[PDB]
């Protein structure tokens, strides 16, 4: 047994995987076996969901997070997001679960049986963390792989049945995307938009054409960058800018994944385009707006003139103006006037919500949708008691949007912590004081006094 | 539900998603067996 104790490796058991830093074979093992764990989870979880799936009940009433992902890709669903065929979910789950055996096989092999280091075995697969060119080369391979994956999304959307479009004319349906947005002004226009209210940066993407065209851009960008990095080595400024070590690269990737996690949190909380409410339930904004809609409808049916109804505060009880004048729902949902959803947009006019359309044109399906979303607002207890914190036990419900937002905020945060930990440690270790201060050469002792 | 032919495997399918967690737990059994050296 090489290096697997603290005396030889310098690392205690609780930092055991740090023993793997310069053992590329066992480390490859660790990575492959882990990828095995991820795929295993996707598969087993998919099959569990399907086994538990009651097809006539809304997905979001059944604690599902993966099946909604498959459905968003156009698999297994028809008009209004209704489940027409459960077999594609089964396929996805099974194929993941079977693939995980393979990844697990290679992982266990490399981890305990295969060559502990790869450098003497092969100069292609072997590597030195401090070898900047090899690092950018492997980086390049993975960039090309990711680019390919993005083009697989594009392919699904354009040539293999399309994607579920909640915005599809006449109602939500699976739609083939024939004209993806290629205009770089729109695509990178998203990247240049404010993350604040009514703008919402990339989280604001509200049509599949933009999503798909964006993935065409990301695909080509990633492939081109991969080729770039296989054909180049880091410039001087980059050499002097970074720390060049395994733990450092790890720290960079941790910061990136933290950032992505926070982005995903906001995406699943606000966006109802790539996270269709048919599958994930209404957003908080969506459900609040839906409440306002619901009672506007009820009270108008009773004879209320909702445009002229003055609330207790002086503001319209049902309808008021946003700070730039748009007609918006009133009450507290005034904060959510940036909300957009297919059930609400037909009532929208040039100046915002249109009083004539509200009086005359509200369809029963809109009332149904507003009621459903209002009564499936993403509020619930940890033990999955649906509704406000004061609601009695009765409804078994916590929105998938809440599970995914909470989970990914926790993970993104701890990944930021990980980033700080490893970036700092990598800096200290590269500089040579990660284990503490040299008593005979304490830097502060050679510095002048502050006062 | 799973396709009818697979129905007999419902209980196994019920337990599968939990397996990855057991791997973390396994790391400690292993470490206990080598005395956390």
């Amino acid at each position: 047994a090489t290096n697997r104790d603290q005396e030889s490796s310098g690392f205690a058991w609780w930092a055991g995987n740090a023993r793997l830093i310069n053992l590329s074979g066992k480390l490859l093992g660790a990575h492959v076996a882990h990828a095995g764990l991820i795929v295993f989870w996707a598969g087993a979880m998919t099959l569990f969901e399907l086994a538990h799936f009651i097809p006539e009940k809304p997905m979001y009433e059944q604690g599902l997070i993966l099946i909604p992902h498959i459905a968003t890709l156009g698999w297994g669903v028809g008009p209004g997001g209704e489940v027409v065929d459960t077999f594609p979910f089964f396929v996805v789950g099974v194929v993941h679960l079977i693939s995980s055996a393979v990844l697990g096989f290679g992982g266990v092999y490399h981890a305990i049986r295969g060559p502990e280091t790869l450098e003497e075995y092969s100069s292609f697969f072997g590597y030195d963390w401090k070898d900047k060119n090899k690092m950018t080369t492997i980086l390049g391979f993975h960039l090309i792989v990711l680019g390919i994956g993005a083009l697989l999304l594009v392919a699904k959307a354009m040539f293999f049945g399309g994607l579920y479009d909640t915005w599809a004319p006449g109602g939500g349906d699976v739609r083939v995307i024939t004209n993806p947005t290629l205009d770089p002004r729109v695509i990178f226009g998203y990247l240049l938009k404010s993350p604040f209210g009514g703008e919402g940066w990339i989280v604001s993407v509200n049509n599949l054409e933009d999503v798909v065209g964006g993935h065409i851009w990301i695909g080509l960008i990633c492939i081109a960058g991969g080729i770039w990095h296989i054909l180049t080595t880091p410039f001087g400024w980059a050499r002097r800018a970074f720390i060049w070590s395994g733990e450092a690269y790890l720290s960079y990737s941790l910061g990136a994944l933290s950032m992505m996690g926070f982005i995903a949190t906001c995406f699943v909380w606000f966006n109802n385009t790539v996270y269709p409410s048919e599958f994930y339930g209404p957003t908080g904004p969506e459900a609040s707006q839906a409440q306002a809609m619901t009672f506007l409808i009820r009270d108008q049916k009773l004879g209320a003139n909702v445009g002229s109804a003055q609330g207790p505060t002086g503001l319209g009880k049902y309808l008021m103006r946003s700070p730039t004048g748009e007609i918006i729902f009133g009450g507290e949902t005034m904060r959510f006037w940036d909300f957009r959803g297919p059930w609400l947009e037909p009532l929208r006019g040039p100046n915002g919500l249109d009083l004539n359309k509200i009086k005359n044109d509200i369809q029963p399906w809109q009332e149904r949708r507003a009621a459903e979303y209002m009564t499936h607002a993403p509020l619930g207890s940890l033990n999955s008691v649906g509704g406000v914190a004061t609601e009695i036990n009765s409804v078994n419900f916590v929105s998938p949007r809440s599970w995914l937002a909470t989970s990914h905020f926790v993970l993104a945060f701890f990944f930021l912590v990980g980033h700080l930990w490893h970036a700092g440690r990598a800096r200290a270790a590269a500089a040579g004081f990660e284990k503490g201060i040299d008593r005979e050469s304490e830097p502060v002792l050679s510095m002048p006094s502050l006062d | 539900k799973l396709p009818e032919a697979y129905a007999i495997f419902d209980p196994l399918v019920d337990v599968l998603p939990v397996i990855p967690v057991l791997f973390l737990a396994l790391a400690f059994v292993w470490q206990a067996a080598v005395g956390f050296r």
Binding site: - | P11, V15, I19, A33
Partner: peptide
């Protein structure tokens, strides 16, 4: 309920079983 507990026990035991087998046969633990 009994089938579930039985699958859990077989899968749950499999790991400690691997460790035990290797410990018995002076394996590369």
């Amino acid at each position: 309920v009994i089938a579930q507990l039985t699958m859990i026990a077989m899968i749950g035991i499999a790991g400690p079983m691997i460790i035990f087998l290797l410990a018995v046969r002076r394996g590369n633990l």
